[PDB]
A paper describes a structure:
Functionally associated with TREX and TREX-2, a less well-characterized Thp3–Csn12–Sem1 complex is recruited to the actively transcribed genes functioning in transcription elongation and mRNA splicing. Bioinformatics and structural analyses revealed that both Csn12 and Thp3 belong to PCI family of proteins, which exhibit similar sequence region characterized by a superhelical (HD) domain, followed by a conserved α/β winged helix (WH) domain. The overall structure of Thp3186–470–Csn12–Sem1 complex has an inverted V-shape with Thp3 and Csn12 forming the left and right sides, respectively. The C-terminal WH domains of Thp3 and Csn12 form a continuous surface to bind different forms of nucleic acids with micromolar affinity.
The initial complex structure of SeMet-substituted structure was solved by SAD phasing. The refined SeMet and native structural models belong to the P3221 space group, and contain single copy of Thp3–Csn12–Sem1 ternary complex in the asymmetric unit. The ternary complex in the crystal is a heterotrimer of Thp3, Csn12 and Sem1 with a stoichiometric ratio of 1:1:1, which is consistent with the gel filtration result. The 3D structures of native and SeMet-substituted complexes are almost identical with a root mean square deviation (RMSD) of 0.25 Å for over 739 aligned Cα atoms. A unique feature is the juxtaposed arrangement of Csn12 and Thp3, which connects the two spatially adjacent β-sheets in the WH domains to form a solvent-exposed six-stranded β sheet at the top of the inverted V structure.
Residue numbers in the entry:
A (entry chain A): 187 to 458
B (entry chain C): 32 to 89
C (entry chain B): 6 to 369, 378 to 423
């Protein structure tokens, strides 16, 4: 028999449960649902700290785990904390939620709302953890599950394709496919995008002897050339940004900014 | 699923291994990777479309 | 009971140890000289009673007579075998190395004991894994420097038992521990190498250990160079012996699933591809429906630089490659194919001139975009060591090295 709770106060703070549960402090789902709305209000109006929302969500999550509620409301709470966690950089609570969501999708009684969205988060997190077996074991699961509607969704295909593009260092389409990502997908990529930019920058610098600064700027989706040079200054490469004047046909001239990528080679191989 | 851990024969002599018979048997791995040309429809048409390029770019 | 007194083992002992296979009508199944009060002598005597009971169960195990569930009776057999093997561990912990292969045959059939059960909600595998972990440990740390009783020569045989258990349900953390600990141990010479281990006495475990290592290295930790090595060595130690009845290699199955990983791993690391006529490749590739066309076509597209054929071969058998743990290998091996095409436009389209226009490769901002994408794919190959060249965005060309332009390890 599952433990049932009757706490009528909407708020509750997280504590790792050491005792056998106290029904007087565990909230029933109707009260957990009334506080979901208040939390959502606060998040939407941005009148609360993420620390505060995360505490309230973990307590909401804890009250569901002791009461054995695995239904559509449960999926809603975990999907909502997962999303908010990604928005604030809390990859640890995202991953706690993501694992539980996937396990709750194994239940046939629970409808698979936003299955493809969280399939995408699973691929993107495995890209961050450098966990390619997981990506492949999940593609194989979808195939053996008969989930062809999900697999031929253009967005899902792109996300799996992105994991392959990182694997073989295709900076050109990976950065070009960064603009196709949904709101929280961008938040997840940002956890490892600096290192990925550095990995892409090494590849460029091992392969050319010099490139335009604009060409570097375009390929890395820098909104302006100032954040382009800040990114090189973050790698101790500012002195390799040289200036060379140009007269292609001896009829007009101008000066362009060059990056001596051959000079950058000596610097960037020291760090990896 | 299917057990491949259960071998049909538990042991054999060393003289009966490919490695030990490998002075009797030639290399299983062909090593002409740099110099092997193969002739098939694809290769033949690859030279075709490239001979065309050399003719227009003389 | 002279095996335990005078520290030797025979087939009769192994046949007594074999509980799955029933014994003939005349039985010699008995212990000897029973008037002992030593605690450790009753460990042997309790072991003897556990053994006779285990053997008897199989006679009644087949005779369910449609009773219904036997999961409890199966669980009876399992703790029968587990407190028996945990007791053999109590015996083998401080005995000489005579008694390690009897420990292993016991262990290996307790794996097939939990192998028959198909339900992992009630899996009793934990008992086995712990029991075998101790068995691996009892040999792994032997404090006797003299080798008469050293049990660290069976260290690798027992690792294959754990590999087998760790692969049952996908656990790539647990396999990873075992590879990394063992590597260190022989490098410090705490255990002897596999070629001078107890695995040479039973060479089935020789091939298996190189498989588990090479598979882990190639499919899980993405170390292809080492993955190729151990898988290749696993095939080089397979017996050239055939079954009389069909004339096919005795280990046809073992050889083929090694070959599934070995062939594409061999092309990626070292640019090696098989001799199809050669007895060993031909004996396996041609007699396996799965590999009979896929792999000749797969090798062909790489050698020839045929990108579409490779992509079609990978698209058509993606389920197969995914289930074999070959996705990264396939995905990385496709860029070898792209590099060979690049080599072919060098040989035949630019006259081996180290300066090559990028528009050559277009014949095989639409055009500006295709060239940007082409620079980037060449840049990644340059940066990975498939091309020794450098790019020029300005003239939209590539500049091959004057020496070693298309390197590959050998």
């Amino acid at each position: 028999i599952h433990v049932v709770g009757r706490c009528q106060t909407l708020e509750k703070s997280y504590l790792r449960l050491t005792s056998e549960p106290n029904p007087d402090l565990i909230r029933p789902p109707n009260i957990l649902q009334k506080m979901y709305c208040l939390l959502m209000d606060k998040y939407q109006s941005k009148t609360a700290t993420y620390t505060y929302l995360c505490d309230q969500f973990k307590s909401m999550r804890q009250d569901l785990r002791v009461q054995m509620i695995e239904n559509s409301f449960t999926i809603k709470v975990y999907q909502t904390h997962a999303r908010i966690a990604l928005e604030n950089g809390d990859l640890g609570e995202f991953n706690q939620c993501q694992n539980r969501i996937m396990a709750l999708f194994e239940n046939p009684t629970i409808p698979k709302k936003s299955y493809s969205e969280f399939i995408c988060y699973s691929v993107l997190y495995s890209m961050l953890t450098e966990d390619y077996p997981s990506i492949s074991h999940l593609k194989l699961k979808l195939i053996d599950d008969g989930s062809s509607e999900i697999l031929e969704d253009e967005h899902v295909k792109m996300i799996f394709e992105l994991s392959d593009m990182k694997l073989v260092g295709n900076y050109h389409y990976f950065m070009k496919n960064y603009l196709k990502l949904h709101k929280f997908e961008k938040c997840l990529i940002n956890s490892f995008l600096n290192l990925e930019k550095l990995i892409f920058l090494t590849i460029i610098c091992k392969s050319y002897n010099q490139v335009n600064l604009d060409f570097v700027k375009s390929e890395f989706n820098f909104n302006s050339i100032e954040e382009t040079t800040n990114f090189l200054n973050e790698q101790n490469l500012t002195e390799f940004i040289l200036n060379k004047q140009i007269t292609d046909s001896n009829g007009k001239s101008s000066n362009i900014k060059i990056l001596n990528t051959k000079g950058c080679r000596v610097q960037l191989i020291q760090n990896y | 699923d299917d057990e491949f851990e259960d071998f049909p024969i538990d042991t054999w002599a060393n003289g009966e291994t490919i490695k030990s018979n490998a002075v009797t048997q030639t290399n299983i791995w062909e090593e002409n990777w740099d110099d092997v040309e193969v002739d098939d429809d694809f290769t033949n048409e690859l030279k075709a479309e490239l001979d065309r390029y050399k003719r227009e770019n003389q | 009971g002279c095996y335990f007194e005078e520290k030797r083992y025979d087939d009769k002992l192994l046949d007594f140890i074999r509980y799955d296979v029933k014994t003939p009508k005349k039985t010699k199944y008995i212990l000897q000289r029973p008037t002992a009060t030593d605690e450790e002598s009753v460990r042997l005597q309790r072991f003897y009673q556990l053994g006779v009971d285990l053997k008897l169960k199989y006679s009644k195990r087949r005779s369910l007579k449609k009773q219904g569930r036997i999961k409890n009776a199966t669980e009876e057999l399992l703790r029968l075998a587990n407190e028996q093997l945990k007791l053999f561990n109590r015996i083998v912990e401080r005995e000489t190395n005579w008694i390690i292969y009897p420990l292993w045959v016991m262990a290996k059939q307790l794996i097939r004991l939990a192998n028959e059960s198909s339900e992992l909600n009630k899996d009793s595998i934990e008992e086995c894994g712990r029991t075998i972990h101790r068995s691996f440990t009892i040999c792994l740390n032997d404090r006797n420097p003299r080798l008469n009783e050293n049990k660290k020569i069976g260290c690798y045989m027992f690792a294959n038992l754990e590999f087998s258990i760790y692969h049952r349900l996908s656990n790539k953390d647990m396999i990873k521990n075992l590879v990394k600990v063992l590597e260190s141990r022989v490098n410090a010479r705490d255990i002897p190498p596999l070629n001078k281990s107890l695995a040479m006495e039973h060479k089935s475990q020789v091939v298996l250990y190189n498989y588990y290592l090479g598979q882990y290295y190639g499919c899980l930790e993405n170390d292809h160079e080492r993955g190729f090595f151990h898988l290749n060595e696993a095939l080089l130690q397979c017996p050239m012996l055939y079954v009389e009845s069909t004339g096919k290699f005795v280990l046809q199955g073992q050889m083929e699933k090694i070959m599934i990983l070995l062939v594409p791993l061999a092309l990626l690391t070292k640019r090696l591809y098989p001799h199809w006529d050669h007895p060993v490749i031909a004996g396996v590739i041609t007699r396996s429906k799965r590999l009979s066309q896929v792999y000749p076509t797969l090798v062909r597209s790489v050698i020839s630089g045929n990108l579409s054929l490779y992509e079609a071969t990978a698209a058509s058998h993606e389920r197969f490659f995914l289930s074999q743990g070959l996705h990264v290998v396939i995905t990385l091996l496709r860029e070898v194919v792209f590099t060979r095409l690049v080599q072919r436009c060098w040989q035949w389209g630019n006259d081996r001139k180290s300066i090559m226009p990028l528009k050559i490769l277009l014949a095989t901002e639409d055009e500006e975009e295709q060239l940007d994408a082409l620079e980037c794919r060449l840049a990644s190959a340059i940066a990975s060591g498939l091309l020794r060249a450098y790019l020029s965005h300005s003239n939209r060309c590539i500049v091959f090295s004057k020496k070693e332009p298309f390197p590959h390890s050998k």
